[PDB]
């Protein structure tokens with residue numbers, strides 16, 4: 001019950017799943033560096049003591065959380081496609097969602 | 111503001127009065143008890159304040175209204191040839207009251223087709239209608255000809271201070287709009303200045319039918335706009 005089969009087995013399924021499809025490589029490494037930007041901003045708020053604008057922090061933070069959200073919501077539609085939604089309609093909706101999130105996060109940075 | 115209309119064959123008067131009572135002001139303020147007892151004692155002889163106004167209108171007037179700034183007033187009585195008015199508060203000495211009246215006459219007795227050309231009209235407008243005992247410190251008479259009218263000649267019996275020709279867009283004025291011919295008279299008396307303003311203009315049938323054809327142009331370009339937005343392929 002040491003769960004040694006879990007991380008190795010899911011490591012084989014996921015790590016085999018990456019290089020079989022070249023676009024999921026783009027999606028999950030871009031998700032990973034979005035997590036690095038969230039960690040860099042969060043340790044900027046920890047390293048100093050104040051969050052002085054506090055709309056700049058939630059601007060630069062909710063653009064990374066929201067963009068990670070939209071990337072997972074596209075990866076789930078490319079790995080196993082939804083019934084009424086094509087793979088090309090899986091991507092234009094991501095574009096429109098990402099442009100709306102970029103507008104609201106450039107309005108919220110002031 | 112008057113509004114000539116060839117499609118409805120009607121002329122539509124609307125007047126905005128800003129009247130003061132320049133009589134003597136009343137000491138000890140105003141008390142409704144002394145006013146109401148003064149009504150209940152006898153007969154309402156001749157006194158200072160304003161309770162009713164008698165508006166002398168043209169002969170056949172149809173749709174009477176009397177509004178303030180804040181809403182309409184229901185205390186008005188439009189009998190034949192005479193439009194009686196009760197304001198909300200009685201206008202004592204020095205008090206202000208700004209109101210608006212309006213009515214609707216047919217156009218067949220204010221407008222006359224000329225003889226040389228069929229599409230040339232001559233209008234004679236009553237310069238002043240109001241209560242019988244009023245003095246007018248400023249009058250601006252705006253007559254509004256329809257959208258394709260072109261004014262040739264202008265005559266007034268009373269010497270005005272100013273005159274100008276502009277345009278103003280009313281309902282369904284898709285093009286430039288109504289022709290606002292506005293006079294500015296300074297000092298007038300209700301009883302004395304008996305006059306009519308004479309406008310000679312033209313209004314050809316080329317511009318008479320451009321109103322339903324202009325609204326037809328907007329409906330047509332809206333529906334061809336619907337056609338472009340339904341023959342267009344957007345399917346990713």
Ligand SMILES: *[C@@H]1O[C@H](CO)[C@@H](O[C@@H]2O[C@H](CO)[C@@H](O[C@@H]3O[C@H](CO)[C@@H](O)[C@H](O)[C@@H]3O)[C@H](O)[C@H]2NC(C)=O)[C@H](O)[C@H]1NC(C)=O
Nearest residue numbers: 126127128129130131179180204205206207208209247248
């Ligand atoms: C109803 O109509 C009356 C009559 O035109 C309006 O009264 C006028 O109001 C203006 C601005 O309130 C007055 O101008 C003022 O002049 C004095 C000096 O005379 C100056 O101290 C003020 O700063 C201002 O410029 C004007 O005198 C006054 N006319 C009369 C005869 O009293 C009234 O405003 C209108 N009310 C509404 C609600 O539309």
Ligand SMILES: *[C@@H]1O[C@H](CO)[C@@H](O[C@@H]2O[C@H](CO)[C@@H](O)[C@H](O)[C@H]2NC(C)=O)[C@H](O)[C@H]1NC(C)=O
Nearest residue numbers: 270271272273274275276277292293294295296
């Ligand atoms: C005579 O009437 C004309 C209207 O054409 C007045 O001119 C306008 O005056 C206003 C000031 O309230 C300006 O905003 C407009 O731009 C003017 N328009 C034009 C075309 O000049 C003029 O002031 C009036 N003159 C007098 C002496 O009453």
